[PDB]
């Protein structure tokens, strides 16, 4: 048997984590022959909830699960990790200023990054989910300089999947028919969904979404607006967060990291802008279209950028830059 | 980049000649872009009148022609029927159409045939269709969110299934189910093709091929147990009738939840006799809880524990039988190679803990349902469906809730939980298991409870 | 290497002289010995027939005859290779040593050291050695070409791989050939279907002993109902024998299937005949086309295959390049690509009969601004121009300090037009873009300075850090050229 | 490692040749010119006849053992080498030598058999100063080694111990000695100065920078004037350039 | 022919138990510890690991138990010992289990019927008979080996371990020193409570 891996989930009492854990344990992430050790970290009050979760997991009798560890201690939780999924973050409260939200998250992710640096394996893979995902991920990475920055990624797969869903709905097709969608930039309302290089399978033939839909107007205006606002719509209707789809997206993201992307297909990921050929500033966490082999990602080069795309990309890069500046003021003062 | 649209009647001569001119321009000119539209002439009047009203144009003859200012389907600027577009092209470009009137007649036929092709293509798309039909009752419920991703996994059926899914509750629940549908679409599963809500009586289960029945959130106040039982009867009757009428004759109906599951199943079967053989109650969650309790006592993993049997009311009085329960990978120094197993009863030296404490613990777990969360419910339902299609693991016992036809002794006409295997798309009852006989007292208790529930519900 | 082989498994290697010398002792007055002497005294150095006989006589030698022999550096002429084939002295496999002259000379200098290891006089002329080596190249090139082409068995070595490295690789390869030979012989005695790759059957025998499918995969006809010409490359890589006849499969997987269940593909058990040659398609060039005149293709250029596959889209009528073009059943066809031609050859019945409508004939003329009349090129250029102007003005509502509004806006718009030009030299475009960004920041100075400076004077050093830089920038712009600056 | 740490790496041939040469130099005649200047230096008081007879026994042994020498002589020379001031100051490095548990015990064990009066424990009479501060194992697939060796230039391998017959026999002998039943490592393992083992085969870099990095990390920072001001000034110039 | 049988014989089970287990795990057979089989057999009735040290510790507890009960009665201020651990009544032994208990106290051989019945289970019956096993702990006595021969029931091989007094102390004596220290701490706590 393959040696068990240690996987950490932070904020494990939160609904996204709760949804995710079963997908983690059942082999959908790491495959049906990888034993897992699962590590759950939360604040002390949640431990009661966390204990209830641990029990329910043990009740699921998942064959690939050979431990569940619940702790409020970073030194325990971050010990010898193989994979860390950072879902826990402070949610923005009413009347909380954006700067205070940033400071609080910077504190949390600085602490977690230092714990990774000290306790975790240097090969650890780190996935950041808690908003603001890009800036939090950057803060963590700066706090874990010994770990290769490529190990650190933030969840943009949710936007990619949403975009694919919207395209498939418009064409009337499965999600599988759609390929090579791109999300550029921040996981925020400023995120840019790009289908200029996306392909779809229609009438047994593969065709490019611009050609297939032939509605550039609707692709620019309505598709983008729908994707950007999809989460707010879901919360407005349910009165509850998008836990199910977030969990799905996280699972997909990790699974593509672990297996790699299919040949001739690329995926969108939030990743450190250093060395991009697209002229995004270095030292940013930006979202790019990427191919993954041997648990290593690479950037899909040579894609032409029209001025519409370029403008969106620079707008979101500006947003990310401002966020970075604000967070780094606290990181240096902290 | 200039952008134009022209709309046609399939018979219109001048629209066809416009198409010729358009293709000439777009081929030769780098600048030129055009999109193409045509309607059946009967539709044309309405379609164009709508377009003209939206624009506040005033054109009626086919073709109609306009330049769209930024992107396909923007606002338009209107050019006139064919002569005006030809005039524009001739003066601005210098171009001339050269097509004969006779040719225009022929192409008018060709475009008639083209519209006939379009119609047949519409019909052709209807032919291509072979989905699996799924329905969910009481869908507006927290369990439903966890369940849907397991369905979408496809492992339930194999990753080769066109899935069509349906979700029911009242319109207020329909709002949150709308949100659920939105998340479902976002889940972008490869096997997902459709999902739907229902709220209305005639529609339900129509050509349903899989039916999932959850607990209800009874929005009514805390009625007495007798009133709760009776309150189920109208709902079970309605569902049974709807299923029997609307569903596919081979529909599979699975009943899951924390309350009165056996009773609900029994009532449904009574109202839906024909399908009743198809209807089963999920016991697996209780078995999982029992396994986990055992594993905690032993300090092993539940997965090592096997062949727990649940004997009773799943959601009520049940007996957990460990006589066949096996443990694997345990560290008895009387240690076998991989796949050796030891008997749980033999290993647990504390018979008092088994008899008093373990039983009391399970009784608490069942009565409270507290630990029966969304994850466990979903896992149980999904895994049961998986075994139903695929089969259960070879040799392994499963527990399932199923209608008694006398098999051990059990009185007929009740739904009981009992040990089972799944094979060839169907379950069999392991009546050949030795020693698994029940005591007369235990059987009397278990059946008597179910009978009393049934009687009270019928009133 | 020859000696190392001979020692290590008791194998033989032969030079021609070895046999002749043996004959001298074995009977100094044998026929072959008598001829050899007669020729020698005539100065006739080894008429080749003598060596040929001696060599096959050496094949008698029981160790070689049962087990193994190698031959070094022989034949030395193509004529010998031919006469050996005439007797059919024919190695199963051949290896070739490629070596830099530098290495050869260095080895020869070590041989010079051995000459002191030696003592008696010996022929050591590097000059002769070089000559001989060059002529070895001359003959070996032709010999390789023939023997590899006919017999699929030629292999090559770098002299700078260590003699042991080379020996290892040669041995391993030879053992591979052995395992192939033995497994094939087993299948033959078992009567099984078997691949024949590196069994080095001659092309001419293969042609003579094809099965009914000739050079085509029967699996292709049976499963696909298509023809794939296996002849198109000589190699046996998907060639196989069964029941006394040869066939090629179209792929490794087809070969695997045929080996597994040959009876299905075997005739007559296959579902279809190979149609007769008159029905089979063939490719063409400009020479064939010129012979086909006065007619063009049976279809006037428009590719039928894509149109048919397109469910007869009007759009599909793009013509195929003549390079693609072929005759089938009396009739000449062209399609959009070589791959289309391949599909046509595979299943021509799908396509060959057509009745396209008259519509969408239009051949392109690429129109040019110069060629256009005034409104057309105006329209083309202005559409982009006005799009850019529209965005630039509407969004910015521009003004820059000191300039008139008109000056600011016009200049900014002209820069914006350059910066977004579809075909502007792009590094220059980005240069203008940079200038435009500076202009934008300078317009931002207006708003910053107006918002931050009150009418009441306020403490100079408590002004914001950028404030004074921005003021200095504004003041400088008063006396700067806006065009360059 | 020697070049980066700036230490001394010694090979058995060197020790043997130097020891022989110095012995012969002392045994060579104190010829008709005065010796070392009789100034403020304490001259050596060897016995030249002892060195002579030692060299004789060495020659006899190598005759008897076909150029091999008795372990006792080699170990004596190694131990003296380590006693030398260069070793005492800076560092000594050996490639795969000593080679057997007995050899290691003989070399490392203190020939002052210190009084055992209560020394029940596992700390032998051994000198920690001569004792290696680091030992590591390096190993690869025998196939990888065979490939590398065969890929060595034929000139390079010419007549060497690495000619394939010699290479094969020595490789076998290497395995055969280092039974997991017993290896030279066992001596250090009993000292619990636990050596560590790095897979050149999997790391596969023919220079194995990766292992060199690991080894450097395990050793830690060189105990030296990592730059002197001359070296600092030059590195500063290199940076400026 | 039957699969492998061995037992390894030597110190106190010690690490040697682990090393036998490792061997069998490499082989993919069964491991057995004979002492385990005794303990578990006794535990079936007992719910306790009977044996020499454990019950002899109870002897001193007799004195302390009675003193604690006197103090608990005179001191109506109730005690940390209120939570007395669970114990059963006598699940009365057969002569077979009696003989086992007496073996644990005496470290002495037992009526052949028991040894025969169990070990013949391990020869005769699956999975053991197909799988084969290595055992820890048996025979303890030449008397037992004698009965093995007199039935004629045999391993493939015996193995014995070469070990000596210091080696044995090195592992065992520290653990026993810990036993002493903790017992003395307990007695100090008893002084304090008294």
Rounded CA-CA distance B263/B415 in Å is 7
Q: Is A238 annotated as a binding-site member?
A: no
Subunit contact B94:C372, Cβ cutoff 8 A? yes
Tell which of C359, C363, C373, C422 to mutate to test the B interface (max B CBs under 10 Å): C359
Q: Tell me the two tokens of residue D33.
A: 């010119």
Q: Give the burial string for B60-89 (b: 16+ CB within 10 Å, else e).
A: eebbbbbbbeeebbbebeebbbbeebbebb
Q: Tell me the two tokens of residue D219.
A: 């050793």
Residues in C closer than 8 angstroms to D163, CB to CB, are 164
Subunit contact C160:D153, Cβ cutoff 8 A? yes
Residues in D closer than 8 angstroms to C163, CB to CB, are 154
Answer yes or no: are the C-beta atoms of A245 and B186 closer than 8 Å.
yes
Q: Which residue in B23, B31, B110 is closest to C379 by CB distance?
A: B31
Q: CB contacts < 8 Å between B and C, how many?
A: 50
Chain B nearest C-alpha distance from A141 (Å): 29
Long-range Cβ contacts of E111-119 (<8 Å, 24+ apart) = E112/E147, E115/E144, E115/E147, E116/E147, E116/E151, E118/E37, E119/E148, E119/E153
Subunit contact A58:B302, Cβ cutoff 8 A? yes
* B-proximal residues of E, 104-163, CB under 8 Å: 127, 131, 136
Using CB atoms, list chains with 3+ pairs below 8 Å to chain D.
C
Cβ burial of E26 (10 Å; 0-12, 13-18, 19+) is exposed
Q: Is A15 annotated as a binding-site member?
A: yes
Rounded CA-CA distance D89/B410 in Å is 92
Q: Which helix (H) or strand (E) holds B38?
A: strand B32-39
Subunit contact D150:C163, Cβ cutoff 8 A? no
Q: Which residue in B333, B336, B338 is closest to E36 by CB distance?
A: B333
Q: Which residues pair with A113 in a beta bridge?
A: none
Chain D nearest C-alpha distance from C337 (Å): 46
Answer yes or no: are the C-beta atoms of C318 and C301 closer than 8 Å.
no
From residue B351, alpha-carbon distances to C310, E39, E46, E88 in Å are: 76, 17, 11, 11
Chain B nearest C-alpha distance from E140 (Å): 18
Chain B nearest C-alpha distance from C309 (Å): 15
Chain B nearest C-alpha distance from E25 (Å): 7
Answer yes or no: are the C-beta atoms of C344 and C326 closer than 8 Å.
yes
Residues in D closer than 8 angstroms to C161, CB to CB, are 154
Residues in D closer than 8 angstroms to C165, CB to CB, are 150-151
From residue E67, alpha-carbon distances to B29, E53, E176 in Å are: 112, 22, 27
Is-catalytic flag, A253? no
CB of B426 less than 8 A from some CB of E = no
Q: Which method resolved this structure?
A: cryo-EM
Subunit contact B106:C364, Cβ cutoff 8 A? no
Q: Which residues pair with A39 in a beta bridge?
A: A8, A69
Residues in C closer than 8 angstroms to D155, CB to CB, are 106
Q: Is E91 annotated as a binding-site member?
A: yes
Chain D nearest C-alpha distance from C159 (Å): 10
Residues in B closer than 8 angstroms to A28, CB to CB, are 153
Overall resolution, Å: 4.7
The SS3 call for residue A127 is strand
Contacts of E178 (CB under 8 A, 6+ apart): none
Subunit contact A22:B375, Cβ cutoff 8 A? yes
Rounded CA-CA distance A228/A237 in Å is 16
Rounded CA-CA distance E2/C294 in Å is 91
Rounded CA-CA distance B166/B143 in Å is 15
- Binding-site residue numbers of C are 21, 73-76, 80
Subunit contact C165:D157, Cβ cutoff 8 A? no
From residue B160, alpha-carbon distances to B157, B164, C154, C431 in Å are: 8, 13, 49, 54
Subunit contact A59:B70, Cβ cutoff 8 A? no
Nearest to A11, CA basis, from A54, A44, A40, A45: A40
The number of CA neighbours under 13 Å toward the Cβ of C183 is 13
Subunit contact B337:E44, Cβ cutoff 8 A? no
Rounded CA-CA distance C54/C37 in Å is 14
Total Cβ atoms within 10 A of residue E15 = 14
What are the φ/ψ torsions at residue C364 (nearest 5 degrees)? -75, 140
Subunit contact C359:B1, Cβ cutoff 8 A? no
Answer yes or no: are the C-beta atoms of B427 and B420 closer than 8 Å.
yes
Q: Tell me the two tokens of residue C310.
A: 């397109």
CB of B337 less than 8 A from some CB of E = yes
Subunit contact A214:B183, Cβ cutoff 8 A? no
Total Cβ atoms within 10 A of residue D24 = 12
The SS3 call for residue B340 is coil
Chain D nearest C-alpha distance from C131 (Å): 25
Contacts of C183 (CB under 8 A, 6+ apart): C194
Q: Which residue in C359, C366, C373 is closest to B107 by CB distance?
A: C359
Residue of E nearest to B350 (CA): E47
Answer yes or no: are the C-beta atoms of A133 and A152 closer than 8 Å.
no
Nearest to C240, CA basis, from C197, C181, C190: C197
Subunit contact C165:D151, Cβ cutoff 8 A? yes
Rounded CA-CA distance B183/A238 in Å is 10
Residues in B closer than 8 angstroms to A220, CB to CB, are 71
Nearest to A112, CA basis, from A156, A74, A85: A74
- Among A160, A187, A197, A253, the active-site one is A187
Q: Is E62 annotated as a binding-site member?
A: yes
Q: Which residue in C311, C363, C375 is closest to B92 by CB distance?
A: C375
Q: Which residues pair with C195 in a beta bridge?
A: C240
Contacts of E53 (CB under 8 A, 6+ apart): none
Nearest to D227, CA basis, from D6, D78, D15: D6
The SS3 call for residue B282 is strand
- Residue by residue, DSSP assigns B381-427 as HHHHHHHHHH-PPTT--EEEEEE-SSSSS--SSSEEEEEEEEETTEE
Using CB atoms, list chains with 3+ pairs below 8 Å to chain C.
B, D
Q: Is A11 annotated as a binding-site member?
A: yes
Q: Which residues pair with C96 in a beta bridge?
A: C156
Chain D nearest C-alpha distance from C1 (Å): 14
Q: Which helix (H) or strand (E) holds C312?
A: none
Packed helices C48-59 and C31-41: angle between N→C axes, nearest 10 degrees: 150
Rounded CA-CA distance E39/E20 in Å is 19
Subunit contact C367:B29, Cβ cutoff 8 A? yes
What are the φ/ψ torsions at residue C420 (nearest 5 degrees)? -105, 10
Residues in B closer than 8 angstroms to E21, CB to CB, are 333, 335
Residue of C nearest to D146 (CA): C165
Q: Write out the residues of chain B at the interface with chain C, using a CB-CB cutoff of 8 A.
A: 1-2, 20, 23-24, 27-31, 91-94, 103, 106-107, 110, 117
Residue of E nearest to B347 (CA): E40
Rounded CA-CA distance B51/B39 in Å is 13
Q: Which helix (H) or strand (E) holds D137?
A: strand D136-139
Subunit contact C376:B24, Cβ cutoff 8 A? no
DSSP state of A221: I
């Amino acid at each position: 048997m393959s040696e068990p891996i240690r996987v950490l989930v932070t904020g494990a009492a939160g609904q996204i984590a709760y949804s995710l854990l079963y997908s983690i344990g059942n082999g959908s992430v790491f495959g049906k022959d990888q034993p897992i050790i699962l590590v759950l970290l939360d604040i002390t009050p949640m431990m009661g909830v966390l204990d209830g979760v641990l029990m329910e997991l043990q009740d699921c009798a998942l064959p690939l699960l050979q431990d569940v560890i619940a702790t409020d201690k970073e030194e325990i939780a971050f010990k010898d990790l193989d994979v860390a999924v950072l879902v826990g973050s402070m949610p923005r409260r009413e009347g909380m200023e954006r700067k205070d939200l940033l400071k609080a998250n910077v504190k949390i992710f600085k602490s977690q990054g230092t714990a990774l640096e000290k306790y975790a394996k240097k090969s650890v893979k780190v996935i950041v989910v808690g908003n603001p995902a890009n800036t939090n991920c950057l803060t963590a990475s700066k706090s874990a300089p010994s770990i290769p920055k490529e190990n650190f990624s933030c969840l943009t797969r949710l936007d990619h999947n949403r975009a694919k869903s919207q395209i498939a709905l418009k064409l009337g097709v499965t999600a599988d028919d759609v390929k090579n969608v791109i999300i550029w930039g921040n996981h925020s309302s400023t995120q840019y969904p790009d289908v200029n290089h996306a392909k779809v399978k229609l009438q047994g033939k593969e065709v490019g979404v611009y050609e297939a839909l032939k509605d550039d107007s609707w692709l620019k205006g309505e598709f983008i607006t729908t994707v950007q606002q999809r989460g707010a719509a879901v919360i407005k209707a349910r009165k509850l967060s998008s836990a199910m789809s977030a969990a799905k997206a996280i699972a997909d993201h990790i699974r593509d990291i672990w297996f790699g992307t299919p040949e001739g297909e690329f995926v969108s990921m939030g990743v450190i802008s250093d060395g991009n050929s697209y002229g995004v500033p270095d030292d940013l966490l930006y979202s790019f279209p990427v191919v993954i082999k041997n648990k290593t990602w690479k950037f899909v080069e040579g894609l032409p950028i029209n001025d519409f795309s370029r403008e969106k990309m620079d707008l979101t890069a500006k947003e990310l830059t401002e966020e970075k500046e604000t967070a780094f003021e606290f990181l240096s003062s902290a | 980049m200039a952008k134009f649209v022209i709309a046609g009647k399939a018979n219109c001569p001048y629209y066809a000649k416009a198409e010729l001119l358009a293709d000439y321009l777009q081929k030769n000119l780098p600048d030129f872009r055009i999109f193409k539209i045509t309607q059946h002439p009967d539709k044309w009047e309405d379609w164009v009148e709508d377009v003209c009203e939206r624009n506040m144009w005033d054109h009626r003859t086919s073709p109609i022609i306009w330049r769209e200012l930024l992107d396909r389907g923007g606002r338009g600027l209107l050019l006139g029927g064919y002569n005006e577009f030809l005039e524009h092209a001739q003066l601005y470009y210098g171009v001339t159409s050269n097509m004969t009137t006779e040719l225009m007649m022929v192409i008018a036929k060709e475009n008639m045939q083209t519209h006939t092709e379009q119609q047949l293509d519409k019909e052709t798309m209807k032919d291509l269709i072979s989905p699996l039909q799924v329905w969910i009752a009481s869908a507006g419920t927290y369990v439903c969110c966890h369940l849907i991703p397991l369905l979408l996994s496809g492992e339930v059926f194999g990753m080769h299934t066109e899935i069509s899914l349906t979700l029911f509750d009242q319109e207020q629940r329909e709002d949150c189910l709308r949100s659920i549908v939105m998340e479902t679409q976002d889940l972008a599963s490869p096997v997902l093709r459709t999902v739907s809500f229902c709220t209305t009586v005639k529609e339900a289960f129509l050509q349903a091929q899989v039916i999932i029945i959850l607990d209800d959130s009874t929005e009514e106040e805390v009625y007495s147990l007798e009133s709760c039982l009776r309150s189920r009867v109208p709902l079970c009757r309605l569902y049974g009738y709807l299923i029997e009428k609307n569903a596919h004759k081979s529909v599979k109906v699975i009943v899951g939840g924390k309350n009165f599951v056996n009773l609900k199943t029994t009532l449904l079967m009574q109202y839906a006799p024909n399908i009743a053989s198809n209807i089963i109650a999920v016991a697996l969650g209780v078995e999982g809880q029992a396994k986990a309790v055992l594993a905690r006592k032993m300090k092993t993993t539940s997965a090592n524990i096997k062949d727990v049997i649940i004997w009773g009311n799943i959601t009520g009085n049940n007996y957990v039988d460990l006589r066949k329960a096996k443990v694997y990978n345990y560290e008895s120094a009387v240690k076998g190679p991989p796949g050796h197993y030891h008997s749980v009863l033999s290993l647990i030296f504390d018979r008092e803990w088994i008899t008093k404490e373990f039983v009391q613990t399970l009784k608490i777990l069942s009565s409270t349902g507290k630990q029966f969360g969304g994850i466990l419910a979903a896992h149980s339902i999904a895994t049961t469906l998986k075994y139903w299609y695929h089969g259960s693991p070879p040799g392994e016992i499963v527990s399932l809730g199923v209608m008694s036809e006398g098999q051990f002794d059990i009185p007929e006409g009740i739904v009981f939980s009992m040990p089972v295997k799944f094979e060839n798309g169907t379950w069999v009852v392991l009546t050949d298991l030795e020693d698994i006989s029940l005591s007369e007292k235990t059987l009397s208790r278990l059946t008597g409870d179910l009978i009393q529930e049934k009687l009270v519900a019928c009133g | 290497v020859a000696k190392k082989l001979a020692s290590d498994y008791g194998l033989r290697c032969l030079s021609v002289g070895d046999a002749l010398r043996g004959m001298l002792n074995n009977h100094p007055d044998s026929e072959l010995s008598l001829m050899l002497n007669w020729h020698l005294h005539k100065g006739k150095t080894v008429p080749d027939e003598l060596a040929i006989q001696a060599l096959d006589i050496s094949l008698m030698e029981s160790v070689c005859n049962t087990i193994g022999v190698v031959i070094d550096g022989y034949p030395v002429t193509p004529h010998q290779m031919d006469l050996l084939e005439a007797r059919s002295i024919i190695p199963m496999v051949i290896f070739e040593l490629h070596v830099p002259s530098k290495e050869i000379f260095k080895r020869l200098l070590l041989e010079k050291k051995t000459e002191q290891s030696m003592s008696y006089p010996l022929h050591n002329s590097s000059q002769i050695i070089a000559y001989k080596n060059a002529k070895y190249h001359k003959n070996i090139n032709e010999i390789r070409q023939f023997y590899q082409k006919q017999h699929q068995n030629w292999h090559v070595i770098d002299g700078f791989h260590s003699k042991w490295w080379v020996w290892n690789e040669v041995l391993k390869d030879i053992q591979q050939m052995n395992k192939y030979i033995q497994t094939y012989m087993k299948k033959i005695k078992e009567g099984k279907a078997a691949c024949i790759d590196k069994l080095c059957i001659t092309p001419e025998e293969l042609i003579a002993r094809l099965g009914e499918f000739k050079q085509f995969c029967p699996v292709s006809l049976a499963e696909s109902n298509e023809l794939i010409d296996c002849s198109v490359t000589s190699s046996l890589e998907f060639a196989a024998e069964f029941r006394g006849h040869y066939y090629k499969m179209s792929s490794q997987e087809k070969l695997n299937k045929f080996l597994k269940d040959p009876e299905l593909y075997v005739p007559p058990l296959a579902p279809h005949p190979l149609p007769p040659d008159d029905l089979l398609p063939k490719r063409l060039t400009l020479s064939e086309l010129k012979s086909r005149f006065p007619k063009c293709a049976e279809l006037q250029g428009y590719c039928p295959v894509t149109y048919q596959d397109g469910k007869q889209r009007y759009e599909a009528l793009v013509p195929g390049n003549i390079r693609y073009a072929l005759e089938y059943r009396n009739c000449i066809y062209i399609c959009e690509s070589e791959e289309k031609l391949q599909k046509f050859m595979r299943s021509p019945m799908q396509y060959w009969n057509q009745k396209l409508p008259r519509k969408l004939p239009p051949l392109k003329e690429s129109i040019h601004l110069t060629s256009l009349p005034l409104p057309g090129y105006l329209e083309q250029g202005t559409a982009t121009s006005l799009i850019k102007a529209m965005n630039a003005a509407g969004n910015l509502k521009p003004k820059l300090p000191f300039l008139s509004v008109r000056r600011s806006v016009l200049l900014y718009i002209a820069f914006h037009l350059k910066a977004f030009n579809p075909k502007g030299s792009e590094y220059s475009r980005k240069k203008y873009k940079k200038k435009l960004e500076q202009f934008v920041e300078r317009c931002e100075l207006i708003t910053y300075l107006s918002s931050k400076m009150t009418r009441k004077y306020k403490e100079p050093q408590f002004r914001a850090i950028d404030f004074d830089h921005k003021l200095q920038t504004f003041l400088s712009l008063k006396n700067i050229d806006p065009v360059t600056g | 490692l020697a070049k980066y740490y700036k230490l001394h790496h010694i090979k058995m041939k060197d020790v043997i040749a130097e020891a022989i040469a110095k012995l012969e130099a002392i045994v060579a005649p104190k010829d008709s010119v005065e010796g070392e200047e009789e100034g403020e230096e304490e001259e050596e008081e060897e016995n030249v006849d002892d060195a002579q007879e030692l060299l004789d026994g060495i020659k006899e042994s190598m005759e008897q053992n076909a150029g091999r020498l008795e372990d006792q002589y080699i170990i004596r020379f190694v131990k003296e080498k380590l006693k030398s001031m260069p070793c005492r100051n800076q560092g000594f490095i050996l490639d795969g030598f000593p080679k057997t548990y007995d050899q290691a015990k003989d070399l490392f064990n203190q020939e002052e058999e210190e009084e055992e009066e209560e020394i029940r424990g596992k700390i032998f009479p051994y000198d920690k100063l001569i004792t290696p501060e680091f030992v590591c194992g390096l190993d690869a697939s025998d196939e990888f080694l065979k490939e590398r060796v065969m890929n060595l230039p034929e000139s390079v391998v010419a007549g060497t111990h690495y000619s394939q017959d010699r290479f094969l026999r020595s490789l076998s002998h290497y395995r055969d000695i280092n039974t997991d039943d017993e290896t030279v490592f066992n001596y250090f393992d009993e000292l619990e100065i636990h050596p560590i083992h790095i897979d050149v085969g999997k790391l596969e870099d023919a220079q194995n920078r990766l292992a060199i990095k690991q080894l450097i990390k395990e050793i830690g920072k060189p105990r030296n004037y990592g730059l002197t001001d001359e070296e600092k000034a030059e590195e500063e110039k290199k940076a400026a350039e | 022919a039957p699969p492998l049988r061995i037992c390894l014989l030597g110190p106190h089970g010690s690490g040697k138990t682990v090393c036998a287990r490792k061997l069998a795990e490499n082989f993919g057979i069964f491991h057995i510890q004979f002492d385990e089989f005794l303990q578990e057999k006794m535990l079936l009735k007992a719910e306790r690991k009977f044996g020499p040290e454990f019950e002899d510790d109870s002897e001193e507890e007799q004195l302390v138990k009675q003193e604690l009960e006197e103090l608990a009665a005179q001191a109506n201020v109730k005690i940390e010992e209120d939570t007395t651990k669970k114990q059963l009544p006598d699940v009365q032994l057969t002569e077979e289990e009696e003989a086992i208990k007496l073996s644990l106290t005496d470290n002495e051989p037992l009526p052949s019927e028991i040894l025969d019945s169990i070990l013949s289970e391990w020869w005769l019956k699956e999975p053991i008979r197909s799988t084969g096993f290595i055992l820890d702990g048996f025979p303890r006595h030449p008397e037992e080996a004698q009965f093995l021969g007199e039935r004629g029931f045999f391993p493939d091989a015996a193995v014995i371990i070469q070990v000596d007094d210091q080696d044995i102390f090195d592992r065992l004596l520290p653990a026993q020193v810990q036993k002493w220290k903790t017992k003395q701490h307990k007695k100090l706590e008893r002084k304090k409570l008294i």
